[PDB]
Amino acid sequence: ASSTNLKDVLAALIPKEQARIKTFRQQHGGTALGQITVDMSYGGMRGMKGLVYETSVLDPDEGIRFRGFSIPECQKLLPKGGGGEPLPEGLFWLLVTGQIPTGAQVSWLSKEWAKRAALPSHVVTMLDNFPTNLHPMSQLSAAITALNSESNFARAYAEGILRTKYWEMVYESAMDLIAKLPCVAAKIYRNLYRAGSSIGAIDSKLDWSHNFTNMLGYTDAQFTELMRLYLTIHSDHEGGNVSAHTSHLVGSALSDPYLSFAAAMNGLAGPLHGLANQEVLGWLAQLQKAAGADASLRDYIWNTLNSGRVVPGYGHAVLRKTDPRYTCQREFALKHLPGDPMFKLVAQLYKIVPNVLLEQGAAANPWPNVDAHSGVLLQYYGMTEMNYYTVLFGVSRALGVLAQLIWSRALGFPLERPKSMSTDGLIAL
Amino acid sequence: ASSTNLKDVLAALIPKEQARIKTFRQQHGGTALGQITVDMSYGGMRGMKGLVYETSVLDPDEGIRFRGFSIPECQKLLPKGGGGEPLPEGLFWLLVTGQIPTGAQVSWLSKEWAKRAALPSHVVTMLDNFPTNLHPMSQLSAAITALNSESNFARAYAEGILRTKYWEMVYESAMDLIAKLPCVAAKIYRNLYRAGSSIGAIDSKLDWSHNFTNMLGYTDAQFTELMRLYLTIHSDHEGGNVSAHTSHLVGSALSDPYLSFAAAMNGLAGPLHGLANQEVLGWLAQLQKAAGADASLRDYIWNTLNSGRVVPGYGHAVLRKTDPRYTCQREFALKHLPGDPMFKLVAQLYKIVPNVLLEQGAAANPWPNVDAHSGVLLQYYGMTEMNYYTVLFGVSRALGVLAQLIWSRALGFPLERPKSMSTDGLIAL
Ligand SMILES: CC(=O)SCCNC(=O)CCNC(=O)[C@H](O)C(C)(C)COP(=O)(O)OP(=O)(O)OC[C@H]1O[C@@H](n2cnc3c(N)ncnc32)[C@H](O)[C@@H]1OP(=O)(O)O
Ligand SMILES: CC(=O)SCCNC(=O)CCNC(=O)[C@H](O)C(C)(C)COP(=O)(O)OP(=O)(O)OC[C@H]1O[C@@H](n2cnc3c(N)ncnc32)[C@H](O)[C@@H]1OP(=O)(O)O
């Protein structure tokens, strides 16, 4: 008997994994997986094997994997809306469960997220009184923090539930959070860019991305497709990246999923992180201001470098080859907006940047990352408010970090609390 | 020529440290400082030497140090208001500079923080519309995120400043943040607990703590003294603790100090972290509800344990002996409120808990931590709104994390981006 329920699947999954991790540790907990050096400690744990994070694994040369599923693999394996791009819903299922969902599973996440999407009065209020000079990443983060009012986990905790059932409330809270997110994000959008307009209602018959673009105001059918891809690809990028790591660190203290997501957004908003999204367009926007020669384009790049600034959208702490996310993006444009002048510029830069970056001899990875390509795509569709882009990143990212947050609590991961040292102390060591 | 300026001192300090860290790394960057195991990775980096953090170092047996200054040492060495407890101002100087400040230095931080204390309209607004069921840690965090509007660093960055001058804007932003904090915190207090009342003005002639209690509404002279100690002791606790680590992680992406502090607060609000503050009182509050026998008190404790809950305010990821912060607290009460029934209970528990905790054989550290003693002190003074306590922790903590945030940027610390692994991956490794 019975129809679909992610929670039921998970309940089945948890105890097996549980057991599986126990014996492994029983046999290998003492095994040395690495060493730490002085440079690593000074260098942002660069290279340091530090976390267990299950939803995705990033390969230095190959790029991100979802099970072991590459982007291209997802591209073909996940269910599409009807109609060529994978549903972030399916991705989510994939992340949570390790398995490739059926259309019928997928339809359920949609329905579920459609059902959950409700904004509370205090929140709408705050969003409506916000200043327009308040950054949208700021706006997003305060709204989600403020949503914690609603936390099913924070309530359950207050009540004194047994630690074993943590995962259960975390899941409810994750699903509600995912559900609401597009409402919060579109509300911000509308407030700032479409004053006097309203987000409208969620149509339980749409996929989450389509509901999103509707609330955002986009009618173009290809844009919905872009949105579907975008939100899928930005999903997750293993645990060591600032955003995901932040959620993980904050969640380990047993701060509810709302608060953990919010902190994460605070990290996504740094220029070295998600904000690169935005920094790229603005850099391209300056660029054009000041159809150019490769040589001038080169002068332009040197000038940033000499200025002690970074070239946005190039480089990676872990990747060492061109991001497949980038490649993915490029292939979308090559299909859909191959003559876009902005597209063309971005293509052009790919020819130049890495080279200039090799010339300088400082970046360990001279290739482009996801951020280098994402704005170009949005602009083309009419979404030209660049200070907004990172919100979109913010929304996708929820899918991965929340998916993981649930396993962490499920596996009983403890407080993230490493040891620090001072220079004096280290020097003496 | 000239009078006092922390920024001038720092400018002198930065380049020396700079040079000092370069050679050390030149010689020892490759030196192995440790290994990582499977258990550490599964165990929240427990035991993992992972960060360089300069302002404070925590000793497993001795407890926290400020240079190398113990709490007792600070107690005697830092300037007092007239009149026995150290000024958090002095502490701050100490943290930033490595040196013990003069009264005249100290008076400057006071003046400076008095000058900087201004709240912006959008922020007051939001605070005033907040729901009363919105947790005060929630309220605090959204307000600080929302303050980012004002970021001098975020502006400078936008503008394209050279990376070398980062520290400079970070400092301005840190000082403004410290300045405003008590305004934000007292505004929350007043809104929730003293409806229709107003925080009043900052008197440039007071120390920061005294200004705080004024805005909070406390007249008792001993309470001001408590506040001074409290805010000093909660200052900083090396870099690996959830809050400080969070600020460090988020700041490494170049998210401004406002956003980094805010995320930190999201971590301070977890039950395993700062919220223990609050959880302790509520646990003592339940306790009393249900002058008791040691034996009943023991039954009570077992019942939590059997229930899969934690005993709040006991245990530590790093300490292995009774927190000196706790001892510090106890000695204050023994001077000032030795007959308090709540005080007496807390004294009583010290006799019992650790023992029950040794009995159970799970906590690695059976001794009490800072959180076990702090609420008792506040209650006595009339501050009995427990869901508020963590805000107070929040305020102190700014002193340490911000002090460090400035050195990080000053030393050019890179993006915090460790490597993660999945179980499968690790298993295969
Ligand atoms: C969503 C995401 O976050 S993907 C990345 C988004 N961010 C960006 O696009 C920002 C631009 N890129 C960068 O700043 C970096 O490449 C990062 C942060 C992504 C990686 O940082 P790290 O792992 O420390 O990089 P790396 O090891 O290559 O650093 C070596 C040196 O090259 C510099 N370098 C690296 N990337 C760049 C870049 N894009 N432009 C200029 N210099 C760079 C580093 O800043 C550093 O300079 P330093 O020695 O004075 O400190
Ligand atoms: C401001 C500050 O954060 S100071 C600490 C504030 N927090 C608290 O007071 C919360 C209560 N204490 C705790 O939960 C813990 O002692 C912590 C989080 C502070 C340390 O966590 P860890 O370093 O992983 O602790 P430890 O290594 O002792 O854990 C061993 C086991 O003992 C348990 N244990 C530790 N402390 C406690 C406690 N106070 N009550 C009951 N059980 C405890 C751990 O939860 C764990 O149980 P598990 O094996 O089912 O996961």
Curated annotation (Swiss-Prot), chains A, B:
Name its GO BP terms in alphabetical order: carbohydrate metabolic process; citrate metabolic process; tricarboxylic acid cycle
Q: Which Gene3D superfamilies match?
A: Citrate Synthase, domain 1, Cytochrome P450-Terp, domain 2
Uppermost EC category? transferase
Q: Which pathway does the database say it acts in?
A: Carbohydrate metabolism; tricarboxylic acid cycle; isocitrate from oxaloacetate: step 1/2
Q: Which domain of life is it from?
A: Eukaryota
Q: What does the sequence similarity comment in the record state about its family?
A: Belongs to the citrate synthase family.
Subunit and interaction comment: Homodimer.
Q: What is this protein called?
A: Citrate synthase, mitochondrial
Say which species the protein is native to: Gallus gallus (Chicken)
